[PDB]
Write a protein that binds this DNA or RNA. Structure first.
Lengths: 51, 125, 99, 108, 543, 359, 113, 125
RNA sequence: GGGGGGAUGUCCGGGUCGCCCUGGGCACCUCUCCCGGCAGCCUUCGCGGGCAGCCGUAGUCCCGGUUCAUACGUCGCCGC
């Protein structure tokens, strides 16, 4: 039973009383930003997509 | 800065909160802050103090004046003592390590004293 | 560094250095004593560096700044640790009055 | 009212764990015990318990009889020698002393 | 200094012999031909071939079969193979423990190893996997043959000693299994001046085989066992380990401090090296979920369970027999009740990848304990058999006191003082009475507020006073203590006392030829299970 | 052996109904092991047994059941009572075990008995030497200690036996945890009695010398902080608190100054000790590196003598050869040194004189 | 080049099979050259390396006698002095270095050394 | 002030050392002090600090600057090393309650700022 | 480290004044026993015990100023 060579495990350090949650990273993962301006700087009324 | 701080702590902003935290003004701000957002301010100050250790002086000043101004305002709350509990936890971690750090401070103060003595000799020579 | 404290070899890891790498480990120790999540390991590394390399501090001026700049941040971390035990008394006063 | 069971288990002594003939059983000699395991399934096939009783007398040596297999020679620190046979237990209750001061080793 | 030797015959006559002497300094000296050198007053110059790889003493050397290879094994947990036709060397490096004995099969195929952690593995050659594995109880043993690297006066000379009792629980939901704390090997456990037992094993009682093994504290089997100076490393010892009411949780405490030789540069004023090592302690409190296949999984780890200006020692933990709750008593004074909640930050729960939610343990209750300082305090706790009351002995010298605390509310139901002569060793709670031992042993009923039986135990050394301990049965109301008969050494005797709850006469008085290191209670039935130094296990039962 | 104690208790019951206190007191003297002379040590008392202790408290003290009772002196003039005080058997667990019958319905029993008992000892003796002995002898909870401090401040706030116990109870109430001290102090104290106590603690702080300078602690800060949190805003809500925090800031600056001077002075003392050792050996002639001038060197490092032992592989210890010792000494010389050989060396008696270049 | 010297003798039995009897690090740098001699009652092997110290090993009594490190400094002293002028003097590759000492030793019985 | 400190310590005077104690010139004073005479200055500063707890705003600069320029002469005097190693033992004993006394400073910085708060509110109402 | 002595070098009252001594300060060599370690040889199964012990310091003919380290099974890319 030769034990398999394991590397050094990184330390699970404790987290403060407001960690970045799974859903906060999930909504931060909407990464790539493209800002398309409207014609003549018109305010955008409504966006929509079909079901 | 009271209404701005009220807005930031009531809608969970970051830009308004940081631009009002980076700045008398602090005393007027916490005195014109709403009573119900004091625990929200305590938690949002404990979070920044944990996440960044270099901002401890101003954040302890803010927490100090908040606990001065709205003391019984947190007692009339009392099912929300867990924000004070997380605050106690953060300050206990900040005050961890003090005896060994004092020993190391003395061990370095000896070197600084000798270096300043040799500079005081080298300026007169 | 925790593995090098657990395996008894932190003195062996620090004892063979030269001037620039002592300055590098001092710079890491100064930069990262601030986090209390590894204040213990970082202070232990600074203990061993003071015990090992405090003899050439007049020999090289740039290390003499890096020993003075690490006292400069250790001096600001008792004031942070005293203000957090000042403020920890006020939180302790409020939880007594809730009762 | 209360009764105490006979001791089982044991610590494996530093005497060499001897292979059987045709390599199918392994004879491991503990303190106060000698037991034969099978090499294939790693389940024990016999446990020959050995009465040790004189504070520290220990099993000094153990070897297969080189004249005939499926025998042993087990010897203590004081003068005692057993000629048991694994796959059975004939020889535990009949030791033979040797009139020593203290028996340091034996080899067959 | 000769540790071992293997002779091979060069042959139906006997032409020569080849001797391989494994010495205590680490080398293996191969004397190639002896009968043709000493057959011929005058002899020619004989000069052994030196093969030096082991740092410590080489425990076993054997020639292999045809005679091409020289297989060997020492403290460094590595089976080494000297190629001996070339100059090369190939090794099976990371076993569990020290290679204490090797043999070669009658054919050339199999090797058989006696590993120092009470084990034997028949390996096959160049598959190099154990085709037969047999494990024992692996507890601390007072060895008969002392040690093979205690011959040459090392930095820490290995001593046959037992400093503390074995940490073991019989597990409910499967009372044939026994969880107990072990190190890597026996010699690697006792080496370093402290017990370094960062592992547990599950050991079958009904058929005495070690079923499985797992790490609790941090261990590095794949790193070097010895420092560069020569001291063996110590690993965090699992001091207190006790098991939940359900059969589904397990809470352990493991402590580690750096060695005394290592500090040397943290001393500033009146600080000695013992004070610096005591300041730099690491006391983790880890909660394990036990699976169906005896596989432990972490759920939480608490780095500082009792904290003030520095970390505080944790003296005992106990499981509530009616709920999933662990009480831990510390050196700050307070008793903390830990309970499992689900992980849920803002209503959004966190679940495992298969779908079940993640449980996490946290401090449900804090109870500060009253102190009574007349002009180094240790603790002990136990629940009732019903729950709903936790008895907490708090332990400054001679003046010490038990506090009976409710569980539903944090208020103190009772306090009882003046019942301890020295420092408290342990305390258990049978059906109505507290059975507690200090220098005295007292059964003290709290439903009557009256001590029934009191004994002044015989004065002995501090090691034996540390190695006395008891255990209650909780099914048939009987308790059982264990005490060696009066520094500890090899030949000592111990005697255990079976008491009933009601009388003062001991119901069974049996002495044993070796000192018993642990007593435990089977949870399903009556009786006890005892584990000896010369590590054999035997069960005591009424009827 | 319960029946023997039961017969002895029935005989003492017969002595109680005879109302002959003297042979009862002599029987208690025989059990505890009239004249009634004392050994002069609070520690050196012989060990007695719990049932006789329980019977002693049951006969001495008394209870009034009207849904809440009152301990009273059935024997207010008794050597048995002063022995219970000096031997410290007057604990709440002891008196509850003595009175399991009448108190099993009573709630808040620890608070009632801890409030009532030191009052009873103080009304027994107006000189309260028995109260100070009880403070020094018995295991005391925070309610008993805050009532005892109330009693001593009632007495004050021939003339030192009270201030001794005033010093004792501060140490005990500093040993107690924060919760029981705060709740018992808030119960049993008035918010002006606390101001009296805070003036006593200021007398223990300023007169001790903390605010006082030099050219002209942990057990009192706990008491001050616990009293301040026990009053809180409901008691106060002047300049008294501003001068209060001024003197506490002054004492804090003193303690921080003591920290800095502690570190510096301890390091200089340890260097001076090891340098004294090395200079003694260099005067013997073992030729180590020592600093010459009277300022401190940069690295506070002294060269030790070479150990007689060597750590070989793998960890073993062997004797140092004098050859290797000479090699390390050849390393320990500098680049220039004057090594005067004397005629006494050439005769074979003395040693040389080495003066080496300061590195 | 691992400053290592290894000694091989033939394995007993089979012919033409050598094996390393023992190795030892005699030098402090690599062992660049060595040559043997065996005659007039003297079997040596002299190994010179990069630390300028020729090390003489006994060949036939190897493992039975200590070796010997010959001096790296030349046999001629290569140090000469004018004592009336107190000049010490030494020469190597093409330079002559002359030191003057300016004072006695009786004067110094450390900042002035 | 270099020559007033020399004469005040050789005669073990009580008054003349204090005349120089209350008054950078202080640093240039002790760099020219005789070193066996310099140990006489440390003997009385350790004598007053050991007998009673207190503070001194001027002596922190005084004691440290002499232990650097004239601490190497401490090897010559075996009496002063034992006096300094019992001095640094008792200065630990003041240092143990620094944590509990800092929490006392917190409550007084809390209550004094809250008593000033109601007094300002009576003039605000 | 102490308990103690023989002897080295020294100033302050000093002494007929010399050998030095008493009173104070002392640093060193040597002797003496207890302190911490190390080995041998008898006794006993061990535990322990007994006997004569060396080391706690300094530089060598040459020279231990050495000897000693933990495998294979398989690599790459991207995703959760």
């Amino acid at each position: 039973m030769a034990a398999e060579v394991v590397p050094l495990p990184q330390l699970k350090l404790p987290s403060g009383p407001s960690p970045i949650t799974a859903e906060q990273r999930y909504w931060r993962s909407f990464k790539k930003q493209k800002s398309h301006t409207s014609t003549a700087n018109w305010p955008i009324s409504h966006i929509s997509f079909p079901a | 800065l009271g209404t701005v701080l009220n807005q930031a702590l009531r809608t969970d902003d970051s830009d308004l909160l940081e631009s009002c935290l980076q700045t008398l003004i602090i005393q007027n701000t916490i005195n014109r802050m709403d009573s119900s957002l004091a625990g929200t301010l305590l938690s949002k100050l404990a979070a920044r103090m944990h996440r960044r250790p270099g901002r401890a002086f101003g954040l302890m000043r803010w927490i100090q004046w908040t606990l001065v101004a709205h003391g019984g305002a947190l007692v009339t709350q009392p099912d929300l003592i867990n924000r004070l509990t997380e605050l106690s936890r953060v300050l206990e971690e900040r005050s961890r390590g003090l005896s060994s750090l004092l020993a190391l401070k003395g061990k370095l103060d000896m070197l600084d004293a000798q270096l300043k003595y040799r500079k005081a000799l080298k300026m007169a020579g | 560094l925790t593995a090098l404290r657990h395996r008894s070899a932190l003195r062996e890891a620090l004892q063979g250095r030269d001037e620039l790498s002592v300055i590098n480990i001092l710079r890491w120790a100064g930069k990262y004593v601030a986090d209390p999540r590894y204040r213990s390991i970082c202070v232990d590394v600074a203990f061993h560096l003071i015990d090992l390399y405090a003899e050439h501090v007049g020999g090289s001026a740039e290390l003499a700044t890096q020993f003075q700049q690490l006292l400069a941040k250790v001096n600001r971390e008792v004031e942070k640790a005293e203000l957090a035990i000042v403020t920890g008394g006020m939180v302790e006063s409020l939880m007594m009055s809730v009762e | 009212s209360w009764k105490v069971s006979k001791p089982m288990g044991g610590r494996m002594s530093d005497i060499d764990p001897i292979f059987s003939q045709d390599e199918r059983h392994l004879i491991i000699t503990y303190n106060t015990s000698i037991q034969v395991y099978s090499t294939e399934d790693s389940l024990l096939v016999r446990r020959i318990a050995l009465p040790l009783t004189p504070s520290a007398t220990h099993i000094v040596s153990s070897a297969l009889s080189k004249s005939n297999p499926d025998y042993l020679w087990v010897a203590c620190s004081d003068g005692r020698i057993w000629h048991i046979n694994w796959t059975s237990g004939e020889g535990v209750d009949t030791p033979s002393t040797i009139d020593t001061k203290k028996l340091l080793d034996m080899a067959v | 200094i000769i540790s071992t030797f293997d002779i091979r015959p060069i042959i139906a006559e006997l032409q020569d012999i080849d001797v391989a002497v494994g010495g205590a300094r680490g080398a293996i000296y191969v004397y190639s031909n002896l009968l043709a050198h000493l057959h011929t007053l005058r002899v020619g110059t004989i000069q052994p071939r030196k093969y030096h790889w082991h740092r410590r003493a080489v425990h076993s050397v054997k020639w292999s079969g045809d005679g091409n290879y020289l297989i060997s094994g020492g403290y460094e947990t590595v089976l080494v193979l000297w190629q001996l036709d070339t100059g090369r060397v190939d090794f099976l490096p990371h076993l569990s423990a020290a290679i204490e004995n090797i043999v070669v099969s009658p054919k050339g195929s199999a090797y058989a190893l006696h590993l120092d952690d009470n084990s034997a593995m028949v390996l096959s050659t160049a598959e190099m996997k154990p085709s037969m594995y047999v494990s024992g109880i692996q507890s601390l043993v007072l060895g008969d043959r002392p040690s093979k690297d205690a011959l040459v006066r090392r930095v820490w000379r290995p001593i046959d000693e037992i400093a503390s009792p074995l940490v073991a629980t019989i597990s409910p939901q499967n009372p044939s299994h026994m969880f107990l704390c072990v190190g890597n090997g026996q010699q690697a456990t006792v080496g370093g001046g402290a017990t370094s037992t960062p592992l547990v094993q599950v050991f079958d009682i009904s058929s005495f085989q070690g079923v499985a093994k797992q790490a609790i504290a941090r261990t590095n089997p794949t790193d070097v066992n010895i420092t560069s100076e020569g001291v063996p490393i110590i690993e965090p010892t699992a001091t207190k380990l006790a098991f939940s009411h359900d059969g589904k949780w397990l809470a352990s405490i493991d402590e580690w401090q750096p060695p005394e030789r290592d500090t040397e540069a943290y001393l500033t004023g009146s600080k000695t090296q013992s004070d610096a090592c005591k300041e730099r302690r690491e006391i983790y409190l880890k909660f394990w979920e036990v699976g169906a296949d005896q596989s432990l999984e972490l759920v939480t780890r608490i780095n500082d369970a009792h904290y003030t200006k520095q970390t505080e020692s944790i003296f005992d933990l106990a499981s509530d027999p009616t709920s999933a709750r662990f009480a831990t008593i510390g050196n700050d004074g307070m008793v903390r009740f830990w309970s499992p909640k689900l992980r849920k930050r803002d209503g959004l729960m966190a679940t495992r990848p298969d779908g079940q939610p993640l449980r996490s343990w946290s401090c449900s209750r804090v109870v500060p304990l009253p102190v009574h300082e007349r002009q180094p305090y240790s603790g002990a706790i136990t629940f009732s058999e019903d729950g709903s009351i936790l008895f907490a002995a708090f332990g400054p010298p001679s003046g010490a006191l038990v506090v009976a605390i409710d569980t539903q509310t944090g208020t103190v139901r009772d306090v009882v003082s003046g019942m301890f002569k020295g420092d408290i060793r342990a305390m258990k709670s049978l059906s109505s009475c507290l059975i507690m031992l200090s220098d005295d042993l007292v059964v003290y009923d709290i439903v009557s507020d009256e001590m029934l039986a009191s004994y002044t135990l015989k004065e002995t050394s501090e090691a034996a006073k540390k190695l006395t301990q008891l255990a209650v049965n909780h099914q048939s109301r009987s308790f059982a203590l264990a005490a060696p008969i009066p520094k500890l050494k090899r030949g000592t005797k111990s005697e255990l006392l079976i008491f009933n709850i009601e009388d003062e006469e001991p119901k069974l008085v049996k002495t044993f030829s070796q000192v018993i290191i642990s007593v435990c209670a089977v949870p399903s039935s009556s009786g006890f299970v005892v584990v000896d130094s010369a590590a054999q296990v035997w069960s005591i039962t009424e009827g | 052996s319960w029946s023997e104690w039961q017969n002895k208790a029935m005989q003492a019951d017969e002595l109680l109904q005879n109302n002959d206190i003297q042979s009862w007191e002599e029987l208690m003297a025989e059990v505890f092991k009239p004249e009634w002379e004392w050994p002069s040590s609070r520690s050196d008392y012989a060990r007695v047994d719990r049932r006789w202790v329980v019977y002693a408290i049951n006969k001495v003290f008394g209870w009034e059941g009207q849904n809440t009772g009152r301990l009273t002196c059935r024997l207010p003039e008794s050597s048995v009572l002063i022995y219970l005080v000096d031997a410290g058997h007057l604990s709440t667990s002891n008196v509850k075990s003595a009175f399991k019958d009448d108190v099993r319905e009573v709630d808040k029993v620890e608070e009632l008995i801890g409030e009532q008992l030191p009052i009873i000892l103080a009304e027994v003796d107006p000189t309260m030497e028995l109260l100070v002995g009880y403070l020094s002898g018995t295991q005391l909870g925070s309610s008993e200690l805050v009532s005892s401090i109330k009693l001593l401040l009632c007495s004050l706030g021939l003339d030192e036996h009270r201030t001794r116990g005033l010093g004792i109870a501060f140490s005990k109430l500093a040993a107690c945890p924060a919760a029981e001290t705060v709740k018992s102090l808030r119960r049993l104290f008035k918010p002006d009695e606390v101001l009296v106590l805070l003036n006593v603690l200021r007398a223990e702080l300023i007169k001790d010398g903390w605010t006082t300078r030099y050219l002209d602690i942990q057990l009192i800060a706990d008491l001050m902080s616990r009293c301040i949190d026990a009053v809180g805003l409901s008691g106060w809500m002047a300049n008294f608190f501003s001068q209060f925090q001024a003197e506490i800031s002054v004492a804090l600056e003193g303690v921080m100054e003591a920290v800095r001077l502690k570190g510096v002075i301890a390091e200089a003392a340890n260097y001076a000790k090891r340098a004294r050792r090395a200079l003694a050996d260099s005067a013997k002639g073992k030729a180590m590196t020592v600093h010459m001038s009277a300022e401190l060197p940069l690295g506070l490092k002294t060269d030790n003598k070479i150990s007689t032992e060597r750590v070989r592989s793998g960890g073993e210890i062997v004797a140092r050869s004098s050859r290797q010792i000479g090699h390390f000494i050849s390393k320990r010389r500098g680049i220039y040194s004057i090594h005067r050989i004397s005629e006494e060396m050439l005769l074979g008696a003395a040693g040389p004189t080495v003066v080496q270049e300061a590195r | 080049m691992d400053r290592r010297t290894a000694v091989y003798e033939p394995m007993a039995g089979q012919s033409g099979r050598w094996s390393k009897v023992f190795h030892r690090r005699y030098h402090q740098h690599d062992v660049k050259a060595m040559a043997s001699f065996e005659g007039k009652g003297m079997s040596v092997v002299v190994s010179g390396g990069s630390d300028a110290s020729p090390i003489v090993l006994p060949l036939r009594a190897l493992g039975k006698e200590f070796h010997r490190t010959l001096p790296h400094l030349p046999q001629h002293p290569t140090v000469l002095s004018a004592p009336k002028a107190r000049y010490i003097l030494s020469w190597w590759e093409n330079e002559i270095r002359i030191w003057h000492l300016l004072n006695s030793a009786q004067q110094f019985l450390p900042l002035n050394l």
